[PDB]
Symmetry: D2
Subunit: 33 residues, 4 copies
Protein backbone atom coordinates (compact mmCIF):
# COMPACT_ATOMS: atom_id res chain seq x y z
CA UNK A 1 0.00 0.00 0.00
CA UNK A 2 2.68 2.71 0.65
CA UNK A 3 4.02 1.96 -2.91
CA UNK A 4 0.50 2.43 -4.29
CA UNK A 5 0.04 5.78 -2.47
CA UNK A 6 3.36 6.95 -3.89
CA UNK A 7 2.27 6.04 -7.44
CA UNK A 8 -1.06 7.84 -6.94
CA UNK A 9 0.90 10.94 -5.69
CA UNK A 10 2.91 10.76 -8.84
CA UNK A 11 -0.19 10.58 -11.10
CA UNK A 12 -1.59 13.64 -9.13
CA UNK A 13 1.68 15.52 -9.61
CA UNK A 14 1.56 14.74 -13.24
CA UNK A 15 -1.91 15.99 -13.60
CA UNK A 16 -1.29 19.20 -11.56
CA UNK A 17 1.86 20.03 -13.74
CA UNK A 18 -0.39 19.66 -16.92
CA UNK A 19 -2.74 22.06 -15.19
CA UNK A 20 0.07 24.54 -14.57
CA UNK A 21 0.92 24.43 -18.32
CA UNK A 22 -2.63 24.98 -19.43
CA UNK A 23 -3.05 27.86 -16.89
CA UNK A 24 0.22 29.41 -18.10
CA UNK A 25 -1.07 29.06 -21.68
CA UNK A 26 -4.35 30.82 -20.65
CA UNK A 27 -2.45 33.52 -19.04
CA UNK A 28 -0.36 33.88 -22.27
CA UNK A 29 -3.51 34.02 -24.46
CA UNK A 30 -5.22 36.61 -22.26
CA UNK A 31 -2.00 38.69 -22.61
CA UNK A 32 -2.26 38.75 -26.40
CA UNK A 33 -5.75 40.26 -26.19
Amino acid sequence: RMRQIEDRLEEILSKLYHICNELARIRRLLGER
Copy 2:
Protein backbone atom coordinates in the same frame (compact mmCIF):
# COMPACT_ATOMS: atom_id res chain seq x y z
CA ARG B 1 -11.92 32.70 -28.05
CA MET B 2 -12.76 33.78 -24.65
CA ARG B 3 -15.51 30.97 -24.73
CA GLN B 4 -12.72 28.44 -25.26
CA ILE B 5 -10.74 29.76 -22.29
CA GLU B 6 -13.78 29.69 -20.00
CA ASP B 7 -14.52 26.08 -20.84
CA ARG B 8 -10.92 25.23 -20.31
CA LEU B 9 -11.04 26.80 -16.88
CA GLU B 10 -14.19 24.89 -16.01
CA GLU B 11 -12.50 21.61 -17.15
CA ILE B 12 -9.43 22.59 -14.98
CA LEU B 13 -11.69 23.09 -12.07
CA SER B 14 -13.42 19.77 -12.52
CA LYS B 15 -10.03 18.16 -12.53
CA LEU B 16 -8.76 20.04 -9.52
CA TYR B 17 -11.81 19.22 -7.39
CA HIS B 18 -11.12 15.58 -8.33
CA ILE B 19 -7.40 15.86 -7.44
CA CYS B 20 -8.48 17.38 -4.11
CA ASN B 21 -10.84 14.50 -3.41
CA GLU B 22 -7.99 12.11 -4.21
CA LEU B 23 -5.68 13.91 -1.93
CA ALA B 24 -8.28 13.86 0.91
CA ARG B 25 -8.58 10.08 0.41
CA ILE B 26 -4.77 9.67 0.60
CA ARG B 27 -4.67 11.57 3.83
CA ARG B 28 -7.38 9.35 5.22
CA LEU B 29 -5.60 6.22 3.99
CA LEU B 30 -2.47 7.49 5.71
CA GLY B 31 -4.44 8.04 8.86
CA GLU B 32 -5.81 4.51 8.87
CA ARG B 33 -2.47 2.72 8.72
Copy 3:
Protein backbone atom coordinates in the same frame (compact mmCIF):
# COMPACT_ATOMS: atom_id res chain seq x y z
CA ARG C 1 6.24 11.98 11.13
CA MET C 2 3.10 10.37 9.56
CA ARG C 3 1.01 12.89 11.64
CA GLN C 4 3.12 15.73 10.24
CA ILE C 5 2.69 14.52 6.62
CA GLU C 6 -1.08 14.37 7.19
CA ASP C 7 -1.11 17.97 8.48
CA ARG C 8 0.96 19.13 5.50
CA LEU C 9 -1.55 17.33 3.15
CA GLU C 10 -4.28 19.21 4.87
CA GLU C 11 -2.54 22.62 4.43
CA ILE C 12 -2.04 21.68 0.68
CA LEU C 13 -5.72 20.75 0.36
CA SER C 14 -6.64 23.99 1.92
CA LYS C 15 -4.52 25.95 -0.41
CA LEU C 16 -5.70 24.06 -3.55
CA TYR C 17 -9.44 24.63 -2.55
CA HIS C 18 -8.65 28.46 -2.27
CA ILE C 19 -7.17 28.12 -5.73
CA CYS C 20 -10.33 26.46 -7.04
CA ASN C 21 -12.39 29.42 -5.67
CA GLU C 22 -10.18 32.03 -7.22
CA LEU C 23 -10.18 30.13 -10.59
CA ALA C 24 -13.97 29.84 -10.43
CA ARG C 25 -14.12 33.59 -9.70
CA ILE C 26 -11.87 34.26 -12.76
CA ARG C 27 -14.01 32.14 -14.86
CA ARG C 28 -17.09 34.10 -13.58
CA LEU C 29 -15.42 37.47 -14.34
CA LEU C 30 -14.37 36.45 -17.84
CA GLY C 31 -18.05 35.43 -18.40
CA GLU C 32 -19.29 38.94 -17.59
CA ARG C 33 -17.06 40.41 -20.31
Copy 4:
Protein backbone atom coordinates in the same frame (compact mmCIF):
# COMPACT_ATOMS: atom_id res chain seq x y z
CA ARG D 1 -9.38 44.37 -15.43
CA MET D 2 -7.90 41.78 -17.56
CA ARG D 3 -4.44 42.91 -16.08
CA GLN D 4 -5.76 41.98 -12.64
CA ILE D 5 -6.83 38.52 -13.82
CA GLU D 6 -3.49 37.84 -15.48
CA ASP D 7 -1.57 38.70 -12.33
CA ARG D 8 -3.91 36.56 -10.35
CA LEU D 9 -3.23 33.65 -12.66
CA GLU D 10 0.52 34.17 -12.36
CA GLU D 11 0.19 34.22 -8.52
CA ILE D 12 -1.92 30.97 -8.78
CA LEU D 13 0.78 29.42 -10.80
CA SER D 14 3.51 30.39 -8.38
CA LYS D 15 1.48 28.78 -5.68
CA LEU D 16 0.74 25.65 -7.63
CA TYR D 17 4.39 25.07 -8.58
CA HIS D 18 5.10 25.37 -4.84
CA ILE D 19 2.30 22.93 -3.91
CA CYS D 20 3.75 20.54 -6.52
CA ASN D 21 7.22 20.79 -5.02
CA GLU D 22 5.69 20.08 -1.61
CA LEU D 23 3.86 17.12 -2.92
CA ALA D 24 7.06 15.75 -4.57
CA ARG D 25 8.82 16.10 -1.19
CA ILE D 26 5.98 14.19 0.56
CA ARG D 27 6.27 11.38 -1.91
CA ARG D 28 9.99 11.23 -1.30
CA LEU D 29 9.49 11.32 2.47
CA LEU D 30 7.03 8.47 2.09
CA GLY D 31 9.57 6.58 0.06
CA GLU D 32 12.26 6.97 2.69
CA ARG D 33 10.31 5.49 5.58
